[PDB]
């Protein structure tokens, strides 16, 4: 069912006016209201779903709580970042059509996802690329964690490049994001009956596989599996993804013996040292424990030193 009449003007709850464009979930190009049509280079998108859609409500709440343009900018200034890969929230509202109620949200428009680019590079990213991606993902994770949320589903298809700057990567898709710490009260080590989702099976955390709610260590664990996938094209459990108990068993055993994971994934060869160190540091975290993000970033910075490079913000894609 069509949710918009192309080129109509929609007004958000803050009375800001936007125009709807072509598709690019149900996502359309959007821009500020003007005499012009919305073009292919539009700086925004409008996400629209029925008002009873759970994920868009969850996502909207995340964006309203943590992604206000001046909230992000303040954090950038105070932590001295070049940028922060949390997309900006521009507004939202309610839209009725054909007697059905819809929710809509306006957010930044992006370029390509990383999964497309990974597959065009024969399912490899270079070590330089992986370290630079991971540093920026750590900035993002620290931010969202400090604002009471975990993502639980970090992967290359949820990483998008700035439309005007291909060295800036953004983490998208908060429809299934979890408020692990509402009002500073950490959730208990247990399943949340309100949350069904377990992340993406090849990348998800051991906590998720055990059926408990995702926490901060889980996000960092997910990023660890992504790094291996990106560097090598593979994960050990990739042929058993229809069998969750196998995937969990494998992740548990490999966490208990990280050297065996390194031998498995970097076979007959030295493993890049930063990856084992990253994983050893994450392994030390308890469920409720606050990560030492700077130490994790130091581990990756040492990997850049090791290859004759530095954090110059260049993703080399
Ligand atoms: Cl804040
Ligand atoms: Cl291959």
From Swiss-Prot:
Keyword annotations of the record: ATP-binding, Cell cycle, Cell division, Cytoplasm, Disease variant, Host-virus interaction, Isopeptide bond, Kinase, Mitosis, Neurodegeneration, Neuropathy, Nucleotide-binding, Nucleus, Phosphoprotein, Serine/threonine-protein kinase, Transferase, Ubl conjugation
Entry's Gene Ontology BP terms: Cajal body organization; cell division; chromatin remodeling; DNA damage response; Golgi disassembly; mitotic nuclear membrane disassembly; neuron projection development; positive regulation of protein localization to chromatin
Effect upon mutating residue 78 to A: Does not abolish autophosphorylation
Family per similarity comment: Belongs to the protein kinase superfamily. CK1 Ser/Thr protein kinase family. VRK subfamily.
Annotated consequence of substituting residue 195 to I: In HMNR10; uncertain significance
MF-aspect GO terms: ATP binding; histone binding; histone H2AX kinase activity; histone H3S10 kinase activity; histone H3T3 kinase activity; kinase activity; nucleosomal DNA binding; protein kinase activity
Enzyme Commission no: 2.7.11.1
Effect on the protein upon substituting residue 212 to M: In HMNR10; likely pathogenic; severely reduced kinase activity resulting in severely decreased autophosphorylation and phosphorylation of COIL, H3, H2AX, TP53, JUN and TP53BP1; does not affect protein stability
Protein name from the UniProt record: Serine/threonine-protein kinase VRK1
Effect seen on changing residue 288 to A: Does not abolish autophosphorylation
Shown chain mapped onto the complete sequence: 20 to 341 of 396
Protein's job: Serine/threonine kinase involved in the regulation of key cellular processes including the cell cycle, nuclear condensation, transcription regulation, and DNA damage response. Controls chromatin organization and remodeling by mediating phosphorylation of histone H3 on 'Thr-4' and histone H2AX (H2aXT4ph). It also phosphorylates KAT5 in response to DNA damage, promoting KAT5 association with chromatin and histone acetyltransferase activity. Is involved in the regulation of cell cycle progression of neural progenitors, and is required for proper cortical neuronal migration.
Consequence of changing residue 126 to A: Does not abolish autophosphorylation
Tissues where the protein occurs: Widely expressed. Highly expressed in fetal liver, testis and thymus.
PTMs per UniProt: Autophosphorylated at various serine and threonine residues. Autophosphorylation does not impair its ability to phosphorylate p53/TP53. Phosphorylation by PLK3 leads to induction of Golgi fragmentation during mitosis.
């Amino acid at each position: 069912a069509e949710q918009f009449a192309v080129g109509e003007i929609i007004t958000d709850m803050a009375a800001a006016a936007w125009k709807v464009g072509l598709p690019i979930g149900c996502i359309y190009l959007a821009d500020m209201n003007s005499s012009e049509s919305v073009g292919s280079d539009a700086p925004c998108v409008v996400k629209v779903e029925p008002s009873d859609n759970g994920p868009l409500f969850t996502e909207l709440k995340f964006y309203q709580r943590a992604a206000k343009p001046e909230q992000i900018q303040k954090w950038i200034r105070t932590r001295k970042l070049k940028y922060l890969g949390v997309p900006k929230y521009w507004g939202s509202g309610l839209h009725d059509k054909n007697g059905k109620s819809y929710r809509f949200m306006i957010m930044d428009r992006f370029g390509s996802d990383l999964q497309k680019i990974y597959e065009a590079n024969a399912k490899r990213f270079s070590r330089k690329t992986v370290l630079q991606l991971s540093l920026r993902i750590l900035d993002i994770l620290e931010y969202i964690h400090e604002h009471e949320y975990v993502h639980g589903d970090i992967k290359a298809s949820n990483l998008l490049l700035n439309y005007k700057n291909p060295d800036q990567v953004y983490l998208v898709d908060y429809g299934l994001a979890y408020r692990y710490c509402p009002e500073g009260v950490h959730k208990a080590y247990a399943a949340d009956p309100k949350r069904c989702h377990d992340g993406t099976i090849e990348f998800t955390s051991i906590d998720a596989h055990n059926g408990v709610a995702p926490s901060r260590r889980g996000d960092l664990e997910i990023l660890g599996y992504c790094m291996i996938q990106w560097l090598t094209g593979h994960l050990p459990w990739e042929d058993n993804l229809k069998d969750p108990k196998y995937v969990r068993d494998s992740k548990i055993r490999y966490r208990e013996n990280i050297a065996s994971l390194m031998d498995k994934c970097f076979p007959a060869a030295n493993a890049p040292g930063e990856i084992a160190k990253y994983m050893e540091t994450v392994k030390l975290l308890d469920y409720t424990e606050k990560p030492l993000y700077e130490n994790l970033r130091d581990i990756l910075l040492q990997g850049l030193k090791a290859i004759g490079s530095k954090d110059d913000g260049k993703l080399d894609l």
